[PDB]
Copies of this chain bind each other. A is one copy, B any other.
Amino acid sequence: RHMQEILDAILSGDAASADYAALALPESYRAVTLHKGEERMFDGLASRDKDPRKSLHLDDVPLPELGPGEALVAVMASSVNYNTVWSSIFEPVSTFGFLERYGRLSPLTARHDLPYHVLGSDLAGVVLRTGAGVNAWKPGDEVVAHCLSVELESPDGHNDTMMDPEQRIWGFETNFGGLAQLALVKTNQLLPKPKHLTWEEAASPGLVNSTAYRQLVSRNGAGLKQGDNVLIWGASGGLGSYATQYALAGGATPICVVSSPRKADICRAMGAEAIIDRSAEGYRFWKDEHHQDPREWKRLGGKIREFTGGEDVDIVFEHPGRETFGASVYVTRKGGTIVTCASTSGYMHQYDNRYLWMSLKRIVGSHFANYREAFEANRLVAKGKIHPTLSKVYALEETGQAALDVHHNKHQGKVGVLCLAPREGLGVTDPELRSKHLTKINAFRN
């Protein structure tokens, strides 16, 4: 196999750039895919009852043609993200609609408009080829990838690339994602691999760490400062496992919300002290399908004040959506910020605008991160200031079970996936820095 020869080169440890440039490309690669003819297979079911194991296929797919500004990457490991779940249950809409619309832009984007969709929005691996116009990256470079896909032909994105009208998420709104043995990315998605981490560890921060960085740290989100109090929903999940770290390292005080004593213990291991278990408290923010209960908003606010000495939070880190959003707006301090990048429990938000306008609060929408933000987030991992939060690793063939874990909220931290890597534990080339941080690196491990 051409693919076995590629893996052997990576595992040897002493292949030069010219060696990678000399390997023959395989004619197909193994990939986790959706099929277009199945996009209605879950019609009539409740979201909970839609099973990613039924929709996710392991296929052999042809290599796409390499274009200008792009790189072909040999993927050692990837991760399950919530967009992998959304894709796999075809909610809110089918990703094939996104691929069809993308394919209308040009003959190059039309490569993506296929009857199958290779998923995955994270990777760690090795560059094999680069297209025309690519100088910064070369075959053999060890990389991780962020998932922003921007074309930058329009002027709109030249003062923050998230504002590009053609901005997409790689592996979700584009094809050739990371849950596969090979991937195709733009080279402006590439970042240097953290040397003290294994392949699966290095693949795990990309998406959620970059998003948490823009949403909480950067001036394009909440602009955290030391001394702030920050309410962090889902503090032991993917986003929250990085948000909590940024709050603590930035000198702020996180109030972490989780739903089990096991996750509460992890938050204490990260260094948080103020932890609310929403299951034990039994919050019912909605009385029925159409009306909320302000008494329950107020009970949450009172519990926060027990931890802060009577202070309300400067920032709410939102993402659960409809269930929690009325409470989030209510409990925020006068002049404070609710920053939101998601709506897991439902995107039709309801809130009492009297609390927003009379208290001069703001709701800031945030979405992934631009390259500069993704670089800064990955830099803090490489410096050993922010740590990966991997809890469990699955084989590529078992990506469906990994997606079901997240779908049903059975996990903590990040769930990783081995792609070409034959086992866990490979890829560390800075053992001294790894040993300095190993206890924190393994804090989420089962």
Contact = CB atoms under 8 A, between A and B. Distances in A.
Interface of A: 67-69, 92, 105-109, 132-136, 151-163, 165-166, 187-188, 191, 217-220, 223-227, 246, 249-251, 290, 321, 325, 334-335, 340-343, 347-354, 356-367, 370-376, 379-380, 383, 385
Assembly stoichiometry (copies) = 4
A334 B156 contact: yes
A41 B262 CA distance: 54
A135 B350 CA distance: 36
B365 A361 contact: yes
B217 A155 contact: no
Contact of A290 (B105, B157, B249, B290): B290
A162 to B, nearest CB: 6
A296 to B, nearest CB: 15
Contacts of A375: 155-156
Given A158-B372, A160-B159, A188-B152, A68 B356 contact: no
14 contacts: A133-B151, A136-B154, A155-B374, A157-B372, A159-B220, A159-B370, A343-B353, A347-B353, A348-B351, A349-B352, A356-B365, A357-B365, A358-B367, A360-B365
Contacts of A334: 156, 163, 165
A165 to B, nearest CB: 7
Contacts of A343: 353-354, 357
B365 A342 contact: no
A352 B358 contact: no
A381 B364 CA distance: 30
Contacts of A249: 226, 251
A133 B186 CA distance: 13
Nearest to A215: B357
Contact of A132 (B67, B357, B361): B67
A366 B354 CA distance: 10
Contact of A348 (B155, B166, B352, B373): B352
